[PDB]
Amino acid sequence: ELPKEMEEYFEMLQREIDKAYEIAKKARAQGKDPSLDVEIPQATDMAGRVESLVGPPGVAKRIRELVKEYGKEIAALKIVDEIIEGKFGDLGSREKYAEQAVRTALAILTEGIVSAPIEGIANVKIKRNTWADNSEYLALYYAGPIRSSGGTAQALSVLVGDYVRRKLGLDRFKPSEKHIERMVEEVDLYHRAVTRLQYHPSPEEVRLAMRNIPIEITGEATDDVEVSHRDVPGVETNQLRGGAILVLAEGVLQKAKKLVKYIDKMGIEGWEWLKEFVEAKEVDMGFYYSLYQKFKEEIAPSDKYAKEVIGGRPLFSDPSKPGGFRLRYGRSRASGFATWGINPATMILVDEFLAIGTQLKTERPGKGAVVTPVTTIEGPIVKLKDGSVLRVDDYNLALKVREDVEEILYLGDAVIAFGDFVENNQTLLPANYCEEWWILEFVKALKEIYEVHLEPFTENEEESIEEASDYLEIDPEFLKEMLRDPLRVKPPVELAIHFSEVLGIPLHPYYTLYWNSVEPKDVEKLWRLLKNYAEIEWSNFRGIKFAKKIVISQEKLGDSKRTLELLGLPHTVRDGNVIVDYPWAAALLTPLGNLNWEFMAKPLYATIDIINENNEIKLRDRGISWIGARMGRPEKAKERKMKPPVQVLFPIGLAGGSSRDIKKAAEEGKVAEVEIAFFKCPKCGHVGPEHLCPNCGTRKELLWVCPRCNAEYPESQAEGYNYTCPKCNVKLRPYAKRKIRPSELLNRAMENVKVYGVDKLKGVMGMTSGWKMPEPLEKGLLRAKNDVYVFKDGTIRFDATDAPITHFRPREIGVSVEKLRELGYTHDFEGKPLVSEDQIVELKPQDIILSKEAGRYLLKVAKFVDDLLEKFYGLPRFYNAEKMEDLIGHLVIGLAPHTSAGIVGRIIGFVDALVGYAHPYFHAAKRRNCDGDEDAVMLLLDALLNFSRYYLPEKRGGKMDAPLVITTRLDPREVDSEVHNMDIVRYYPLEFYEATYELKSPKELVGVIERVEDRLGKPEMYYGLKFTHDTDDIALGPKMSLYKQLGDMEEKVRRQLEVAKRIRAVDEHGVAEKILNSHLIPDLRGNLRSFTRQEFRCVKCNTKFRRPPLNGKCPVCGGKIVLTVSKGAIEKYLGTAKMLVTEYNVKNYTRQRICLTERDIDSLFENVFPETQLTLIVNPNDICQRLVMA
Partner DNA sequence: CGCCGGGCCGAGCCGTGC
Partner DNA sequence: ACGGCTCGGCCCGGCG
- Window contacting Zn ion (CB under 5 A); options: 149-157, 612-620, 638-646, 706-714: 706-714
Q: Which is nearer to DNA, 130 or 1045 (CB)?
A: 1045
Part in contact with Mg ion (CB under 5 A); list of ranges 478-486, 552-560, 692-700, 929-937: 929-937
| β-pair partners for 547 | 538
Min dist. Cβ of residue 636 to DNA (A): 9
Cβ-based nearer residue to Zn ion, 693 or 850: 693
Report the Cα 1034 to chain-centroid distance in Å.
19
Q: Residue ranges of the alpha helices (H) in 1044-1167?
A: 1049-1062, 1068-1091, 1134-1143, 1148-1164
1101: partner contacted, choices DNA, Mg ion, Zn ion, none (Cβ within 5-8 A by kind) = Zn ion
β partners of residue 703: 714
Q: Per rule CB under 5 A, is residue 929 in the interface with Mg ion?
A: yes
Residue 1156: contacted member of Zn ion, Mg ion, DNA, none (CB under 5 to 8 Å, by partner type): none
The continuous run of DSSP H or E covering 522 comes out as: helix 520-532
Q: How many residues bind Zn ion (CB under 5 A)?
A: 16
Cβ-based nearer residue to DNA, 123 or 1078: 1078
What is the pattern of x (binds Zn ion, CB under 5 A) and - over residues 679-698? --x--x-x------x-xx--
- The nearer residue to Zn ion, 1024 or 1119, going by C-beta atoms, is 1119
Residue closer to Zn ion (CB basis): 60 or 692: 692
Angle between helix 1049-1062 and helix 1134-1143 axes, rounded to 10 deg: 30
Per-residue binder mask for Zn ion (CB under 5 A), 1077-1116, x = binder: ---------------------x-xx------------x--
Site for Mg ion in 932-951 (CB under 5 A): 933
Nearer to Zn ion, 671 or 728 (CB): 728
The residue among 389 and 1076 lying less far from DNA, judged by its C-beta, is: 1076
Half-sphere exposure of 332 (CA within 13 A, CB side): 28
For DNA, the closer of residues 36 and 1116 by Cβ is 1116
Q: Is-contact 671 741, C-beta < 8 A? A: yes
Single-letter amino acid, residue 158: V
Residue nearest to Zn ion (CB): 709
Whole-angstrom Cα distance, residue 777 to residue 445? 77
Supply the DSSP symbol for 934. Answer: E
- Partner that binds at residue 192, options Zn ion, Mg ion, DNA, none, CB closer than 5 to 8 Å by kind: DNA
Q: Which stretch binds Mg ion (CB under 5 A): 294-302, 851-859, 862-870, 926-934?
A: 926-934
Between 1007 and 1128, CB nearer to DNA: 1128
SS3 sequence, 962-1012?
A: CCCEEECCCCHHHCCCHHHHCECCCCCCHHHHHHHCCCCCHHHHCCCCCEH
> Which phi and psi (to 5°) does residue 194 adopt?
-120, -65
Instruction: Output the residue with the shortest Cβ distance to Mg ion.
Output: 929
- Alpha carbons 122 and 158: distance in angstroms, whole number: 14
3-state secondary structure 200-259: CCCHHHHHHHHHCCCCEEEECCCCCCECCCCCCCCCCCCECCHHHHHHHHHHHHCCHHHH
Choose from Mg ion, Zn ion, DNA, none: what does 644 bind? Cβ within 5-8 Å by kind: DNA
Query: Min. distance of Cβ 1112 from Zn ion in angstroms?
Result: 12
- Residues whose CB falls within 8 Å of the CB of residue 26, separated by 6 or more in sequence, listed in order: 875
The least distance separating Mg ion from the CB of residue 928, rounded to whole angstroms, comes to: 7
CB of 646 to DNA, least distance (A): 9
Please give the residue ranges that form the binding site for DNA (CB under 7 A). 192-196, 308, 633, 643-645, 658-660, 762, 1044, 1047-1049, 1052, 1078, 1081-1083, 1085-1090, 1094-1095, 1097, 1099, 1102, 1119-1120, 1122, 1124-1129, 1132
**Contact by Cβ (8 Å): 103, 117:** yes
Give the shortest CB-924-to-Mg ion separation in angstroms: 12
- Looking at the DSSP bridge assignments, the partners of residue 798 are 639, 937
SS3 939: strand
Cα–Cα distance measured from residue 175 to residue 218, given in angstroms and rounded to the nearest whole number: 12
Other CB atoms within a 10 A radius of the CB of residue 739 amount to: 9
Cα distance between residue 598 and residue 615, in whole Å: 10
Nearer to Mg ion, 334 or 939 (CB): 334
- Torsion angle of C-alpha atoms 103, 105, 108, 111, degrees rounded to 10: -50
Whichever of 101 and 706 has its CB closer to Zn ion, that residue is 706
Listed ranges 218-226, 422-430, 703-711, 999-1007: which one lies at the site for Zn ion (CB under 5 A)? 703-711
Contact present, 80 and 163 (Cβ < 8 Å): yes
Rounded least distance, CB 370 to Mg ion, Å: 10
Nearer to Mg ion (CB atom), residue 216 or residue 931 = 931
Q: How far is the CB of 307 from DNA (least distance, A)?
A: 9
Q: Does 1119 bind Zn ion (CB under 5 A)?
A: yes
Residue with Cβ nearer Zn ion (645 or 1119): 1119
**In the complex, what is the shortest distance from the CB of residue 368 to DNA, in angstroms, rounded to a whole number?**
9
Stretch that binds Mg ion, among 117-125, 700-708, 924-932, 1182-1190 (CB under 5 A): 924-932
User: Whose CA is closest to 969, among 42, 26, 1?
Assistant: 42
Beta strands in 840-927 (DSSP E): 841-842, 847-850, 891-895, 901-910, 915-918
Closer Cβ to Mg ion, 639 or 931, answer by number: 931
Q: What is the DSSP letter of 595?
A: G
Residue count (the chain) = 1190
Q: How far apart are CA 951 and CA 824, in angstroms?
A: 39
695 binds, among Zn ion, DNA, Mg ion, none (CB under 5 to 8 A by kind): Zn ion
Among 132, 1008, 1117, 1187, binds Zn ion (CB under 5 A): 1117
Give the contact letters, 524-563, x = binds to Zn ion (CB under 5 A), - = no: ----------------------------------------
Residue 263 vs 936, nearer CB to DNA: 936
Enumerate the H helices of 282-340 as residue ranges. 287-298
Candidates 162-170, 426-434, 540-548, 927-935: pick the segment binding Mg ion (CB under 5 A). Answer: 927-935
How many residues touch Mg ion under the rule CB under 5 A: the total is 3
| Residue 363 Cβ vs Mg ion, minimum distance, rounded to whole Å | 17
Q: What, of Zn ion, DNA, Mg ion, none, does residue 929 touch, CB below 5 to 8 Å by kind?
A: Mg ion
User: Alpha carbon 369 to chain centroid distance?
Assistant: 8
Question: Which whole-number Å values give the CA distances from 103 to 71, 100, 161, 499, in the listed order?
Answer: 19, 5, 10, 66
Q: Is residue 899 near Mg ion by the rule CB under 5 A?
A: no
Q: CB of residue 930 vs Mg ion: minimum separation in angstroms?
A: 7
Among DNA, Mg ion, Zn ion, none, what binds residue 1102 when CB lies within 5 to 8 Å by partner kind? Answer: DNA
Give the whole-angstrom CA distance, residue 603 versus residue 872: 86
**Residue 506 CB, nearest distance to Mg ion (Å)?**
40
State the helix-helix crossing angle for 72-85 and 151-167, rounded to 10 degrees. Answer: 40
Cβ neighbours around 694 below 10 Å, total: 11
Cβ at position 223, least distance to DNA in Å: 10
| CB 1075 to DNA: min, Å | 10
**Terminal alpha carbon distance of the chain:** 85
684 binds, among Mg ion, DNA, Zn ion, none (CB under 5 to 8 A by kind): Zn ion
Residue numbers at the binding site for Zn ion (CB under 5 A): 681, 684, 686, 693, 695-696, 706, 709, 725, 728, 1098, 1100-1101, 1114, 1117, 1119
Residue numbers at the binding site for Mg ion (CB under 5 A): 929, 931, 933
